[PDB]
């Protein structure tokens, strides 16, 4: 079905601890495939998935150059932010950026994104129309005027409609055996007596990809969402994910409870 590609920038200034640090990660769906850290000895964009290693050298030199220029320009962006808010040069501040594209089953653009945050709060975002900006405050309005006078939205639109989608489709073809294969969850149920009259039933889903999953406990076919404890989906470290759902039930009534899993990889 639908797929996605995203890049995450984090720039962190640190007075007295060296120049600001810059980190970039790239994701196709829930799979990390590229990384960069300005604090590296010889900073370069490095592969993190097998199917991205087939890219020749020129790709890696180009991406590394992009990342070094991004390092410098986001140091300047941190300086500009400190100027806009009349903040002190002794404090640490963070600029974040998410951008990329969502494509549908036909492989063409379905939605674009380019959002920037400062100190954890929204700074400026690119609206759905790929042609206008949403600003968070007055400083963001200064940035928005600078960018709409520079016709930034059109270049963002050109990238998101073009290179984003094409490169994402190439990545999907190169890694079709992992990115387009759905790993169904392996599920089981554990019992834990919490007292003499209650027992905790925990339903486990392990080793599934992608991360989207729905785990519900049912009692006599009735959803127990009000009574279910659900942990946030977590990575296993092998590019798969884990989740569990727990309910406390009266002893001797366990047979009324069944776990229900919804995942793309299950028929």
């Amino acid at each position: 079905g639908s797929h996605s590609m995203r890049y995450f920038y984090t720039a962190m200034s640190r007075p007295g601890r060296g120049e600001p640090r810059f980190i970039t990660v790239g994701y196709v769906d829930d799979t990390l495939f590229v990384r960069f850290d300005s604090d590296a000895t010889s900073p370069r964009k490095e592969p993190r998935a097998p199917w991205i290693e087939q890219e020749g050298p020129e790709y890696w030199d180009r991406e590394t150059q992009i990342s070094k220029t991004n390092t410098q320009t986001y140091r300047e962006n941190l300086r500009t932010a400190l100027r806009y808010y009349n903040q002190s040069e002794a404090g640490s501040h963070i600029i974040q950026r998410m951008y990329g594209c969502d494509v549908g089953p036909d492989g063409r653009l379905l939605r674009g994104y380019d959002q920037y945050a400062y100190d954890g709060k929204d700074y400026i975002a690119l609206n759905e129309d790929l042609s206008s900006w949403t600003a968070a405050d007055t400083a963001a309005q200064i940035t928005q005027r600078k960018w709409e006078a520079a016709r930034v939205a059109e270049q963002d639109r050109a990238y998101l409609e073009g290179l984003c989608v094409e490169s994402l489709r190439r990545y999907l073809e190169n890694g079709k055996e992992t990115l387009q294969r759905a790993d169904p969850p392996k599920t089981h149920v554990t019992h834990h007596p919490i007292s003499d009259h209650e027992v905790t039933l925990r339903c486990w889903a392990l080793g599934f990809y992608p991360a989207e999953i729905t785990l519900t406990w049912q009692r006599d076919g009735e959803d127990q969402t009000q009574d279910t404890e659900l942990v946030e989906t977590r990575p296993a470290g092998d590019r798969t994910f884990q989740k569990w759902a727990a309910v406390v039930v009266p002893s001797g009534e366990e047979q009324r409870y069944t776990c229900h899993v919804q995942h793309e990889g299950l028929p």
Partner: peptide, 9 residues
């Protein structure tokens, strides 16, 4: 692939 046009604040 990455967008090579950065834009200052």
């Amino acid at each position: 692939e990455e967008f090579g046009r950065a834009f200052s604040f």
